Amino acid sequence: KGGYTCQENSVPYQVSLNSGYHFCGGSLINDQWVVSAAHCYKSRIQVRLGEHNINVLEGNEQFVNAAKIIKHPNFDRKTLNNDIMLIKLSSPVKLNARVATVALPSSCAPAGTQCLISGWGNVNEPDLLQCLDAPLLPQADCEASYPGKITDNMVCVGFLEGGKDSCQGNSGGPVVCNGELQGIVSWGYGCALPDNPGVYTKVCNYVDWIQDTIAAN
Amino acid sequence: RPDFCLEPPYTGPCKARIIRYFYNAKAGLCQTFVYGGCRAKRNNFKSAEDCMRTCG
Ligand SMILES: [Ca+2]
DSSP string, A94-107: ---SSS---BPPSS
Taking the CA of residue B8 as centre, how many other CA atoms within 13 Å lie in the half-sphere pointing to its CB?
2
Which residue, among A133, A157, A29, has the nearest Cα to A84 in the 3D structure?
Answer: A29
Interface contact B15-A23, CB threshold 8 A? no
Q: Distance between CA A130 and CA B17 in Å, rounded?
A: 15
For A159, the domain range is 1-11+102-204
Same domain, A56 and A112: no
Same structural domain, A7 and A106: yes
Is residue A52 located within the same domain as residue A68? yes
* Amino acid at residue number A196: N
Does residue A56 have a known ligand-binding role? Answer: yes
Interface list for chain A against chain B, based on CB atoms closer than 8 Å: 21-24, 37, 39-40, 77-78, 80, 121-122, 166-172, 185-189, 191, 198
Instruction: Provide the 8-state DSSP code for A40.
Output: G
Give yes or no for a contact between A38 and A24, defined as CB atoms under 8 angstroms apart. no
First to last CA, chain A: 38
Amino acid at B36: G
Count contacts between A and B (CB, < 8 Å): 60
Burial of B27 (0-12, 13-18, 19+ CB in 10 A): exposed
Cross-sheet strand order for the sheet of A174-177: A4-5, A130-135, A114-119, A174-177, A180-187, A198-202, A154-157
First to last CA, chain B: 7
Distances (CA, A) of A48 to A12, A45, A99, A215, B19: 11, 10, 10, 24, 19
Q: A135 with A170, same domain?
A: yes
Whether residue A189 is found in the same domain as residue A141:
yes
CATH number (domain holding residue B39)? 4.10.410.10
Residue A35 sits in a domain of what CATH number? 2.40.10.10
Residue B12 near residue B40 (C-beta atoms within 8 A): yes
Q: Between chains, do A187 and B38 touch, taking CB under 8 Å as contact?
A: yes
CA of A62 to the centre of ligand 1 (A): 9
Q: What is the DSSP code (8-state) at residue B14?
A: B
**Cα A91 to Cα A110: distance, rounded to the nearest angstrom:** 36
Domains in chain B, number: 1
Give the domain extent around B35. 1-56
Distance A9 CA to ligand 1 centre (A): 11
Query: Determination technique for this PDB entry?
Result: X-ray
| Calpha distance A94→A77 (Å, rounded) | 34
* Catalytic residue list of A: 39, 83, 171
Is there a single domain that holds both residue A89 and residue A139?
no
Residue A53 counted as an annotated binding residue: yes
* Residue A134 sits in the same domain as residue A160: yes
Q: Which residues surround ligand 1, an ion (CB under 5 A)?
A: A 51, 53, 58
Query: Closest to B17 (Cβ–Cβ): which among A37, A80, A168?
Result: A168
> Measured in angstroms, how far is the CA atom of residue A58 from the centroid of ligand 1?
5
**Cα-to-chain-centroid distance, residue A118:** 7
Resolution in A: 1.7
- Ligand 1 center to residue A140 CA distance, Å? 40
Has A51 been labeled as part of a binding site? yes
Residue A178 gets which letter from DSSP?
Answer: T
Q: What does each C-alpha distance from B29 to A83, A155, B18, B25, B33 come to in angstroms? A: 34, 40, 20, 7, 13
Question: How many domains are contained in chain A?
Answer: 2
SS3 A140: helix
Beta-strand pair A14-18/A22-30: antiparallel
Residue A143 shares a structural domain with residue A167: yes
